[PDB]
């Protein structure tokens, strides 16, 4: 078997976004370069609304 758990099922995706979301869901099965944690933001602006 090439993978213990497949990265994603190709028959379920419909666009590029679906692949990205599926890859994030199955990333726990793979050996990760950096294990995700809470993100840290150094840049934030709020624009005026309607």
């Amino acid at each position: 078997k090439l993978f213990e758990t497949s990265p994603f099922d190709p028959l379920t995706i419909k666009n590029n976004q679906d692949v990205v979301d599926k890859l994030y869901a199955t990333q726990s099965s793979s050996i990760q370069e950096v294990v995700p944690t809470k993100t840290f933001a150094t840049e934030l602006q709020f624009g005026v609304t309607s």
Binding site: P7, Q27, I31, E33
Partner: protein, 51 residues
């Protein structure tokens, strides 16, 4: 190394169907393996029994 002999009937009148195509792994190999490498490495580590 040598193959073991069959029965005498099979040597005189025996026939076998064989396919000589060996194939290639390139279609599976030829890709951008960047994202699938991590998943394949996890399966690789599990193949050998772990202490």
């Amino acid at each position: 190394y040598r193959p073991r002999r069959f029965k005498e009937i099979e040597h005189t009148h025996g026939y076998v169907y064989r396919e000589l195509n060996q194939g290639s792994l390139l279609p599976l190999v030829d890709a951008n393996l960047k994202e699938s490498s991590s998943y394949y490495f996890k399966k690789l580590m599990s193949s050998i029994s772990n202490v």
